[PDB]
Amino acid sequence: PKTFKFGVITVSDKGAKGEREDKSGPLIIEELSKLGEHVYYKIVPDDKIEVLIALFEAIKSGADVVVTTGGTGITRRDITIESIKPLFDKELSFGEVFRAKSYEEVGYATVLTRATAGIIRGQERIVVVFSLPGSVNAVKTGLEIIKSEVFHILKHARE
Amino acid sequence: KTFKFGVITVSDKGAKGEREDKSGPLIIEELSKLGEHVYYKIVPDDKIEVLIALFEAIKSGADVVVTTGGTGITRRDITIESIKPLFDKELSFGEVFRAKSYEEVGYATVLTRATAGIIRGQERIVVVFSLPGSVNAVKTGLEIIKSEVFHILKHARE
Amino acid sequence: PKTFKFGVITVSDKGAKGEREDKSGPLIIEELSKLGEHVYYKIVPDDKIEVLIALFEAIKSGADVVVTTGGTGITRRDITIESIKPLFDKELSFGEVFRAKSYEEVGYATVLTRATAGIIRGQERIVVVFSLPGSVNAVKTGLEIIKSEVFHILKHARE
Amino acid sequence: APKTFKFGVITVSDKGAKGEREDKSGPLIIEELSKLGEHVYYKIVPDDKIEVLIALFEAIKSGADVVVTTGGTGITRRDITIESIKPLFDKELSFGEVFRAKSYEEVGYATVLTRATAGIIRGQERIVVVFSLPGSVNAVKTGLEIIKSEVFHILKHARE
Amino acid sequence: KTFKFGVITVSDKGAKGEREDKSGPLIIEELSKLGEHVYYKIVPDDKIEVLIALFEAIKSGADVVVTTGGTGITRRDITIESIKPLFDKELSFGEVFRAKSYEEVGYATVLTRATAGIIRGQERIVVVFSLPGSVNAVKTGLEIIKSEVFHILKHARE
Amino acid sequence: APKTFKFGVITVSDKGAKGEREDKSGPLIIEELSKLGEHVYYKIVPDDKIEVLIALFEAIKSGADVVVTTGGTGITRRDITIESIKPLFDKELSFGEVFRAKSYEEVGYATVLTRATAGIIRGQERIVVVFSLPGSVNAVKTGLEIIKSEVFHILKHARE
C-alpha cells in the first residue's frame, strides 16, 4: 500500500457563497499531500445533491480516499452523514476513535461531535470516505488519525 | 410543462461493447416526446459506476433519470441496492409496475424488481426510476413513466 | 371481537389554521361510528410533533384503532408516514390492498398513492393505526377496506 | 442451469409441535414439491425464533436449495417466522405481492392480513431460496401454485 | 438561557406503587437548577405507556425530556427500542456516557445502554435523553446532561 | 440465577477451514472458557455466510447458551461474520465499544479497523449470547478478558 489519490470536499452554505474563507479544506490538502496525491477539491453548500455530485466527481477523478469537512452536526441544514452513510458497504469505527481523542480537547462536548468513515465498493474498486466536522480544529484532530491509519485501511479494504 | 432527463443502462456486456443497447435508445426516444434529453451513458453492473453516472446526469440538469438493468437477483445486480438508499421519498412504482406486468408474464413477476423515488437538495428535486433490462420491461415502465412523470414532478416540487 | 373505540386525526396546515373545512375527518367519524365508538378527533398541522401528540392522546383516550388522513404524499411538508411507521411492531398489507382498489379509480396515479397500516403493541394492549391520504375520495375508498377488515384485524392483533 | 433441486419443509405451530393439531399443510407441501425436487428434510417446530432458525439451517445443511416454512406469518405476538428469517435474505423477492394478488380473488380485502415472503440467502457460491407461507391449507395451496410455477426460474437467476 | 423539561421513570414496580422512585426526583432536583420543570410521571415498562408520557411531557412544553429505566437487555426493557426510532438526529450520548461509566464499573458497561436524540417538528425541537434506572447511572448522566444541555439546544434550534 | 452455562466456539477462516493455517484462536477460547462453562461445540468454517450460520445453529442445538466466533470481522469482501449474525440479535450489547476501549491501549488508532460485536438471540423463553471477535490471537485475548468478566452478568440480565 505505497501511495493513494485523495479528494476533499468542504460543505458550507457560507463557504460556497464566498462569505467565509475555507481553511479546513486546504488543511486536509496540505496534510494528506504528505502521504498521497491530491486530485480533487470542491466547496459545496449544505445540500444533499451538491454533496453527492462532489463525492462522485472526486471518485471519478481517481480518489481512493475522500474526506469531507462540514455538515456533520445536528442542525436542520446538516445533511452530510445522512447523505453519505447509506452508501457504505463497510462501516469503520472512525467516529468512535475520533471522539475518544476529541474528549481530551472538548470533553463532554463530544456528545455533539459527529464524524464517520466507510468503504464504498465497486466490483473491484474501493473508496474510503471520512466525514469530519467543519471546524479547523476538529479537522486538525481528525487528520492525525487519518494520517496514521489511511494506509492500514486501504490495505485491508482491498481484500 | 417540461423537464430535462437522463438515461443510464447498466450492463457488463453492454459496457464492454459486446452487446447492443436497445433499451436505452427506446427510453430516449420516448421521453424526448415529453421533455428534454440531457444525458446518456452505459455502465457496468458496478455500484461506483452506476452512482458516478447518476450524479453526472443530475449535474447535467436531469430532473428525471431512468436507469435500466441491474435490478435482478443475481450477485452482479446492484442497481436498486445502490440507489434506493438515497431516496428521501419512495414512490409505489415497483408495485404498479408489477401489477401491469402480472398481465403479460403472470407469476414470473416474483422476479421483477423496479423502483422509483425522489432525491432532494435544499430546493431541487430529482425523480429516479429504475427498471429491468429487457426491452419488454422497459416498454411497460415507459407507459407508467410517461403517464405520471409530470404529476410526480408537480407534487415533489411543491 | 364485538366493538372497539376509535380516534381520528386530520393532518393539514390549512385545516389546522381554519382556512379549509375538514370533510375527511368527519367522514371517518360517521363511517366508523356504525362499527364502533368514536372517542377522539383532532386537526393538526403537517408537523411531526403535533401528529404524534395527537396519536398518543387518541390512544390515551382509549382508541383501539386510529385513522389519520393527510400528509401521506411526497412533498416536503408530508411527514405522516415517516413519523408513524417506525413505531409499528407489525406492519399490515393495507397500502397494497388500498392501491389495488384505487387503481380502478385513478389507475397509474396510484404510483403516488401512499397509505399504510400497522400495529403498535404494549405489554397487553394493541392499537391499529391506518394512515390515509388527505382527499375525501381517497378516504372514502380507504374506509370500505377499513370497515370490512377492522374486526378481522383486531381479533388477530389481540393474540 | 439447474436439473433438479433439493428441498426442506418446516411447519411452525405451537399446537402442532406439541401433538395437538394434526399437521395437514407440511405434508401437502411435501407431496406437491416432491413432484419437482428431492425432499430432504421435514420438522414441526413451535412458534419460536430459535427453533425455527435451528430447523432452517438443518434443512440447509442436509443440502436443501429451497425451503418452505408454513405458519407463524400473522400479526399475533406468537408469530415470529418472517421476523426471524427475512433479515437473513441477501435479495428479497416480490413473492408476497404476487401471493397477495392471487389470494385476493378468493379472499378480497382479507389480504390486508396476508403475509408471506421469499428471498435468497447466499454463501460464497451456494444459494438457498426460502419461501414463507401462512398456516392454512388454502393459503398453502395458493403459495404452491406459485412455487411450482417459479422455483426453477428463481433458482436459475439466483445462481446467475 | 432556559428550557422547560420533563422526567419519566419507567418501571413496572415503580408504577404499581410497590417500590419508591429515587431516580426521578433526583433528575427533577438537578435540572430545576438549570431550567423549568413542567412534567413528571411514572409508567410501566410498556411502549404505549412510555410514548403517551413522552408526548404528554412534550405537549406540556418540555424542550428536554429525560427518561430513566427500561434501557436494559431483559424482555421487559423497551425504552430505547420505543424512542430511538423517533429521532431525526441521534447524539453520541450513549458513547460518552459509557466512557464515563467505564471508570466506575469497567467491563460491566457492556450492559450499559443510554441514548439521546432530537425530535423535530416544522420549527420546534425536543431533546430526549434515555438513561438507565440506577441512581448511580442517573448521577453520571446528569453530569453530562447539565454540562451540555444548553449547547445541544443551541445547535438543534439553529 | 445461572449456575453454569454451555458454550460453542466457531473460528471462521478460509485458510483454516482448508487445512493450511493452524487454528490457534479457537483452542485458546476453548481453554479459557472451559474454566467457566461446559464446552459443547467446535468447528472451523470458511468465511462463508451459510457455513457460519449452519455452525451457529448447530452450537445452539447442542445446548450452547454462549457462542463465540473468531474471524471474519474485518473490512475485506471475504468478511461476512458480523453481517451474517448481527441481524439476528433481539438486543445488541455495547461489547464493541468496550473491546475497542481496552484494545486502544495496546494498538491506539488501529482500533478504527477493530470490529467486534455481541448480542442476544431469544426464543419464547430461551436466550443465546453471541460474541464475535477478530481473528488474531491478541484480539482474542482482549475479548476473552471481557467475556470472562461479564458472561454471567450478561446471562443473568438476558434471561431476566
Author numbering:
A (entry chain A), C (entry chain A): 11 to 169
B (entry chain B), E (entry chain B): 12 to 169
D (entry chain C), F (entry chain C): 10 to 169
Paper text:
Within their active site, molybdenum or tungsten are chelated by a metal-binding pterin (MPT, also known as molybdopterin) forming the so-called molybdenum (Moco) or tungsten cofactors (Wco), respectively. Wco and Moco biosyntheses represent multistep pathways that start from GTP and involve three isolatable intermediates: cyclic pyranopterin monophosphate (cPMP), MPT and adenylylated MPT (MPT-AMP). MPT-adenylyl-transferases (EC 2.7.7.75) convert MPT to MPT-AMP, prior to the final metal insertion step, which requires either tungstate or molybdate to produce Wco and Moco, respectively. In this study we investigated the influence of hexamerization on the structural stability and enzymatic activity of P. furiosus MPT-adenylyl-transferase MoaB (PfuMoaB).
We determined the crystal structure of PfuMoaB at 2.5 Å resolution and engineered a hexamerization-deficient variant of PfuMoaB using structure-guided mutagenesis. PfuMoaB was crystallized in the space group P3121 with three molecules (chains A, B and C) in the asymmetric unit. Each PfuMoaB subunit consists of a slightly bent central β-sheet, surrounded by six α-helices and two 310 helices. In the crystal structure a hexamer can be generated by rotation of the asymmetric unit by 180° around the two-fold crystallographic symmetry axis. Therefore, similar to the other proteins of the MoaB family, PfuMoaB represents a dimer of trimers. In the crystal structure of PfuMoaB residual electron density was observed in close proximity to the Gly-Gly-Thr-Gly motif. PfuMoaB crystals were grown in a solution containing 2-(N-morpholino)ethanesulfonic acid (MES), which with its negatively charged sulfonate part resembles sulfate or phosphate. Therefore, only a sulfate molecule was manually positioned into the respective electron density patch leading to an improved overall model quality. Assembly of subunits into trimers is additionally strengthened through several ionic interactions, including salt bridges between Arg109 of one monomer and Glu106 of another monomer, and a cluster of ionic interactions involving Lys100 of one subunit and Arg124 and Glu92 of the adjacent polypeptide chain. Thus, hydrophobic residues of α3-helix were identified as key residues for the association of two trimers within the hexamer.
